[PDB]
Assembly symmetry: C3
Homo-oligomer: 190 residues x 3
């Protein structure tokens, strides 16, 4: 039955299946006090914004300090390189040397978001959904935790319209807008 | 693409765009101890149930005590007047003298709610959504906080079927039913 | 208007109306210290997986210890009998002697769940909804509390794809999968 409710109405499933591949797991490693032996300090999610392997996450998953390894949905790990890390903006860009063209999430214009729009908050995997709760930051219903922090908050078209953050206020989560990411990204390409 | 998921399925956005104008921000002001100088004690949301400017909220946003100012979505502030405040019912009615016909939210019959119905919880702006979790009060999934307390909980037709309240139990929010509001409202018109 | 949003899009209401009858309220009673006088120790939900009145819940609503009474949506109470209680699996099967064929929830294959699928978490009544947050246990957005613990987590077809559990982690609820239930159930029929 394509007249069935499950087929007719799992539009979030449809979005997640489309974006999961471009969402990646990031791990921050620090060196032990007087050792050459590094160990993971921070873990998070990010996503790919370019075929050759540019990746964006927030400044908490990645900070210029440490060493970063990326792991792709498929399960191959990759030493990643830190191209830029704006702390004020809470955004980070890293690059991995992948063999062949990668899958990419396009950015949506977060000024077009309408209050009430469904969005999907996704990481590495773990996915929650909700709506845009306010027209800075984008606020939302959707739970954000360590499973999806750093990862994208997307609209029903599969367009990144935020980065998930762990800031929460009275049940409401906060994400950095894609418009800040657009900005950040163009000012790095300098 | 009107075949796009974002167009096809943002029905909550569609409801919010329709009701936002009739949802208003209320502020309760008290006089300082021995001064003529008043200051805001309480803040909340309400909505309009009549063109000339009758407005309903709960008895926590407004209580016969203080002084109330209303601010409309558009941003004009207005001294509001307290027409009735049932404490047992946790409902309040106030009136503002607006220049011209205002937008109005109709009441739905909250006995018709079916378990599982999507409802939208809205304030001033900030919006959350969920479902009716139980057939007194209407219980629901949707987060209610200071952003939308006092404001309406509506059904997918844009009909007020509750007032948002800050009572919460094991994750579940409570709203005063429109049927109590209908009651309250008719017993005031006395 | 069947072109109305409320008619067009309350698919969760539609599912809940279909499954509510097969969802039941369970109560665990223990004997007072040196008395014949028993009193309720635990309360929960379950559901029916057979016309003659087999019922499943988790091992927390029911444990081989106590005495169990079932109450049906309609409101008739029934002494229930404990047919099997796997503690490691956190599943329990009980049987009630009902007069006539009861309504039954079929099991879906929880390996078919896709991340993002809407599911509905239901008890006795109280209902919450969310999505599958991870491909062991099924994780989800939906609030699970005492209102629906023990009860089924279902997919949009009305197929039980989990049992609701009170385990929670960073906002995310856990349910025992239908595939474990299938397993459990066939190994009991021994």
């Amino acid at each position: 039955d394509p007249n069935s409710l499950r087929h007719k109405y799992n539009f979030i499933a449809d979005v997640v299946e489309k974006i999961a591949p471009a969402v990646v797991h990031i791990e921050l490693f620090r060196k032990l006090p007087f050792s050459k032996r590094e160990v993971p300090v921070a873990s998070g999610s990010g996503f790919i914004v370019s075929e050759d392997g540019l990746i964006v996450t927030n400044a908490h998953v990645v900070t210029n300090k440490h060493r970063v390894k990326v792991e792709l949905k498929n399960g191959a790990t990759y030493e990643a390189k830190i191209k830029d890390v704006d702390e004020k903006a809470d955004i980070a860009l890293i690059k991995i040397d992948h063999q062949g063209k990668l899958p990419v999430l396009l950015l949506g214009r977060s000024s077009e978001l309408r209050p009430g729009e469904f969005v999907v908050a996704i990481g590495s995997n773990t996915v929650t959904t909700g709506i845009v709760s306010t027209t800075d930051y984008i606020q939302t219903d959707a739970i954000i935790n360590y499973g999806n922090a750093g990862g994208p908050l997307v609209n029903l078209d599969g367009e990144v319209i935020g980065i998930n953050t762990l800031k929460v206020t009275a049940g409401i989560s906060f994400a950095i807008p894609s418009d800040k990411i657009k900005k950040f990204l163009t000012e790095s390409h300098d």
